[PDB]
Protein backbone atom coordinates (compact mmCIF):
# COMPACT_ATOMS: atom_id res chain seq x y z
CA UNK A 1 0.00 0.00 0.00
CA UNK A 2 2.78 2.43 0.87
CA UNK A 3 4.63 1.69 -2.38
CA UNK A 4 1.48 1.95 -4.49
CA UNK A 5 0.42 5.22 -2.84
CA UNK A 6 3.88 6.78 -3.16
CA UNK A 7 4.71 9.78 -5.32
CA UNK A 8 7.05 7.60 -7.38
CA UNK A 9 4.17 5.29 -8.32
CA UNK A 10 2.05 8.33 -9.13
CA UNK A 11 4.72 9.71 -11.46
CA UNK A 12 5.15 6.31 -13.12
CA UNK A 13 1.56 5.17 -13.60
CA UNK A 14 -1.01 7.77 -12.50
CA UNK A 15 0.18 11.04 -14.08
CA UNK A 16 1.24 9.82 -17.58
CA UNK A 17 -2.07 8.10 -18.29
CA UNK A 18 -5.82 8.71 -18.45
CA UNK A 19 -7.97 7.46 -15.56
CA UNK A 20 -9.19 4.40 -17.49
CA UNK A 21 -5.59 3.40 -18.15
CA UNK A 22 -4.94 4.19 -14.49
CA UNK A 23 -7.61 1.71 -13.44
CA UNK A 24 -6.27 -1.07 -15.63
CA UNK A 25 -2.62 -0.45 -14.68
CA UNK A 26 -3.23 -0.31 -10.94
CA UNK A 27 -5.45 -3.38 -11.19
CA UNK A 28 -2.61 -5.18 -12.97
CA UNK A 29 -0.05 -4.13 -10.36
CA UNK A 30 -2.14 -4.69 -7.24
CA UNK A 31 -4.72 -7.37 -8.08
CA UNK A 32 -2.93 -9.35 -10.77
CA UNK A 33 -5.68 -8.88 -13.35
CA UNK A 34 -7.00 -6.37 -15.86
CA UNK A 35 -10.20 -4.44 -15.23
CA UNK A 36 -12.93 -6.97 -14.79
CA UNK A 37 -16.24 -5.46 -15.93
CA UNK A 38 -17.92 -2.15 -16.65
CA UNK A 39 -19.13 -1.83 -13.05
CA UNK A 40 -15.54 -1.99 -11.81
CA UNK A 41 -14.49 0.66 -14.33
CA UNK A 42 -17.35 2.90 -13.19
CA UNK A 43 -16.49 2.44 -9.52
CA UNK A 44 -12.80 3.23 -9.85
CA UNK A 45 -13.41 6.05 -12.35
CA UNK A 46 -15.83 7.65 -9.90
CA UNK A 47 -13.30 7.37 -7.09
CA UNK A 48 -10.55 8.85 -9.28
CA UNK A 49 -12.88 11.65 -10.37
Amino acid sequence: QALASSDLYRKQFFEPYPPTKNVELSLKHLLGRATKDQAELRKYNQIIA
Binding site: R10, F14, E15, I48, A49
Partner: protein, 160 residues
Amino acid sequence: SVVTKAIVSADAEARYLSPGELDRIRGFVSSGERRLRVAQTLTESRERIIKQAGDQLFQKRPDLVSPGGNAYGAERTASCLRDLDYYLRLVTFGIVAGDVTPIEEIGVIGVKEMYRNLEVPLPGMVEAVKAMKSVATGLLSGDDSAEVGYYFDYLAGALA
Protein backbone atom coordinates in the same frame (compact mmCIF):
# COMPACT_ATOMS: atom_id res chain seq x y z
CA SER B 1 8.55 23.56 -12.12
CA VAL B 2 6.55 25.15 -9.31
CA VAL B 3 3.47 25.24 -11.53
CA THR B 4 3.83 21.60 -12.55
CA LYS B 5 4.30 20.41 -8.97
CA ALA B 6 1.24 22.38 -7.86
CA ILE B 7 -0.84 20.99 -10.74
CA VAL B 8 0.17 17.35 -10.21
CA SER B 9 -0.36 17.62 -6.45
CA ALA B 10 -3.84 19.07 -6.98
CA ASP B 11 -4.59 16.46 -9.65
CA ALA B 12 -3.57 13.73 -7.21
CA GLU B 13 -6.54 14.77 -5.04
CA ALA B 14 -8.94 15.39 -7.96
CA ARG B 15 -9.27 19.01 -6.88
CA TYR B 16 -8.47 22.51 -8.01
CA LEU B 17 -5.49 24.41 -6.67
CA SER B 18 -5.87 25.53 -3.06
CA PRO B 19 -5.38 29.17 -2.01
CA GLY B 20 -1.91 28.23 -0.78
CA GLU B 21 -0.99 26.59 -4.09
CA LEU B 22 -2.24 29.58 -6.09
CA ASP B 23 -0.38 31.93 -3.74
CA ARG B 24 2.79 29.88 -4.24
CA ILE B 25 2.49 30.07 -8.03
CA ARG B 26 1.75 33.80 -7.78
CA GLY B 27 4.87 34.38 -5.70
CA PHE B 28 6.87 32.30 -8.17
CA VAL B 29 5.76 34.23 -11.25
CA SER B 30 6.22 37.53 -9.40
CA SER B 31 9.85 36.50 -8.89
CA GLY B 32 10.45 35.48 -12.51
CA GLU B 33 12.63 38.45 -13.42
CA ARG B 34 15.19 38.05 -10.64
CA ARG B 35 15.36 34.37 -11.54
CA LEU B 36 15.97 35.29 -15.17
CA ARG B 37 18.74 37.75 -14.34
CA VAL B 38 20.38 35.19 -12.05
CA ALA B 39 20.32 32.78 -15.00
CA GLN B 40 21.82 35.63 -17.07
CA THR B 41 24.65 36.05 -14.58
CA LEU B 42 25.40 32.32 -14.49
CA THR B 43 25.23 31.88 -18.27
CA GLU B 44 27.22 34.97 -19.27
CA SER B 45 30.16 33.90 -17.10
CA ARG B 46 30.00 30.10 -17.38
CA GLU B 47 33.49 29.71 -18.85
CA ARG B 48 35.15 31.57 -15.98
CA ILE B 49 33.08 29.67 -13.40
CA ILE B 50 34.02 26.29 -14.85
CA LYS B 51 37.69 27.26 -15.10
CA GLN B 52 37.90 28.46 -11.49
CA ALA B 53 35.93 25.47 -10.20
CA GLY B 54 38.28 23.12 -12.02
CA ASP B 55 41.30 24.87 -10.53
CA GLN B 56 39.88 24.63 -7.00
CA LEU B 57 38.87 20.99 -7.46
CA PHE B 58 42.28 19.98 -8.80
CA GLN B 59 44.15 21.89 -6.09
CA LYS B 60 42.10 20.31 -3.29
CA ARG B 61 42.26 16.91 -5.05
CA PRO B 62 45.59 16.45 -6.87
CA ASP B 63 45.02 12.69 -7.08
CA LEU B 64 42.40 13.15 -9.81
CA VAL B 65 44.88 14.83 -12.17
CA SER B 66 47.84 12.70 -11.12
CA PRO B 67 48.67 9.57 -13.14
CA GLY B 68 46.27 6.84 -12.10
CA GLY B 69 43.58 9.41 -11.33
CA ASN B 70 40.21 9.39 -13.03
CA ALA B 71 40.73 12.86 -14.50
CA TYR B 72 44.37 12.32 -15.51
CA GLY B 73 45.32 13.45 -18.99
CA ALA B 74 44.08 16.12 -21.37
CA GLU B 75 40.90 14.42 -22.59
CA ARG B 76 39.80 13.13 -19.19
CA THR B 77 40.31 16.58 -17.66
CA ALA B 78 38.28 17.98 -20.55
CA SER B 79 35.53 15.46 -19.75
CA CYS B 80 35.72 16.53 -16.10
CA LEU B 81 35.21 20.17 -17.04
CA ARG B 82 32.45 19.12 -19.45
CA ASP B 83 30.58 17.43 -16.60
CA LEU B 84 30.98 20.58 -14.51
CA ASP B 85 29.57 22.60 -17.43
CA TYR B 86 26.62 20.19 -17.68
CA TYR B 87 25.80 20.69 -14.02
CA LEU B 88 26.13 24.47 -14.23
CA ARG B 89 23.64 24.52 -17.11
CA LEU B 90 21.38 22.28 -15.02
CA VAL B 91 21.55 24.71 -12.11
CA THR B 92 20.50 27.52 -14.45
CA PHE B 93 17.61 25.33 -15.64
CA GLY B 94 16.53 24.71 -12.06
CA ILE B 95 16.77 28.40 -11.20
CA VAL B 96 14.42 29.37 -14.02
CA ALA B 97 12.13 26.43 -13.21
CA GLY B 98 11.96 27.48 -9.58
CA ASP B 99 12.67 23.95 -8.36
CA VAL B 100 15.34 21.27 -8.63
CA THR B 101 13.13 19.22 -10.93
CA PRO B 102 15.07 19.78 -14.22
CA ILE B 103 18.27 19.08 -12.30
CA GLU B 104 16.58 15.98 -10.91
CA GLU B 105 15.55 14.36 -14.20
CA ILE B 106 18.50 15.45 -16.31
CA GLY B 107 21.31 14.87 -13.86
CA VAL B 108 20.37 13.17 -10.59
CA ILE B 109 18.31 10.10 -11.51
CA GLY B 110 20.71 7.27 -12.20
CA VAL B 111 23.77 9.45 -11.60
CA LYS B 112 25.25 6.94 -9.15
CA GLU B 113 24.95 4.10 -11.66
CA MET B 114 26.45 6.29 -14.39
CA TYR B 115 29.44 7.34 -12.30
CA ARG B 116 30.05 3.81 -11.04
CA ASN B 117 30.02 2.57 -14.62
CA LEU B 118 32.45 5.33 -15.56
CA GLU B 119 34.52 4.84 -12.36
CA VAL B 120 34.19 8.51 -11.45
CA PRO B 121 34.49 8.82 -7.65
CA LEU B 122 31.46 10.46 -6.07
CA PRO B 123 33.41 12.41 -3.39
CA GLY B 124 35.23 14.00 -6.31
CA MET B 125 31.87 15.08 -7.70
CA VAL B 126 30.88 16.49 -4.31
CA GLU B 127 34.11 18.49 -4.06
CA ALA B 128 33.73 19.76 -7.63
CA VAL B 129 30.15 20.85 -6.98
CA LYS B 130 31.15 22.60 -3.75
CA ALA B 131 33.92 24.45 -5.61
CA MET B 132 31.52 25.47 -8.37
CA LYS B 133 29.05 26.57 -5.69
CA SER B 134 31.64 28.86 -4.13
CA VAL B 135 32.75 30.29 -7.47
CA ALA B 136 29.20 30.92 -8.70
CA THR B 137 27.97 32.38 -5.40
CA GLY B 138 30.94 34.75 -5.37
CA LEU B 139 29.53 36.29 -8.55
CA LEU B 140 26.02 36.93 -7.23
CA SER B 141 24.50 39.15 -4.56
CA GLY B 142 23.63 37.70 -1.18
CA ASP B 143 19.92 37.20 -1.82
CA ASP B 144 20.60 35.49 -5.15
CA SER B 145 23.68 33.68 -3.86
CA ALA B 146 21.72 31.93 -1.11
CA GLU B 147 19.08 30.77 -3.58
CA VAL B 148 21.61 29.35 -6.03
CA GLY B 149 23.56 27.84 -3.14
CA TYR B 150 20.48 25.86 -2.20
CA TYR B 151 20.47 24.37 -5.72
CA PHE B 152 24.18 23.54 -5.52
CA ASP B 153 23.55 22.00 -2.09
CA TYR B 154 20.75 19.88 -3.53
CA LEU B 155 23.11 18.69 -6.27
CA ALA B 156 25.88 17.91 -3.77
CA GLY B 157 23.51 15.99 -1.52
CA ALA B 158 22.34 13.97 -4.50
CA LEU B 159 25.92 13.12 -5.44
CA ALA B 160 26.83 12.34 -1.82
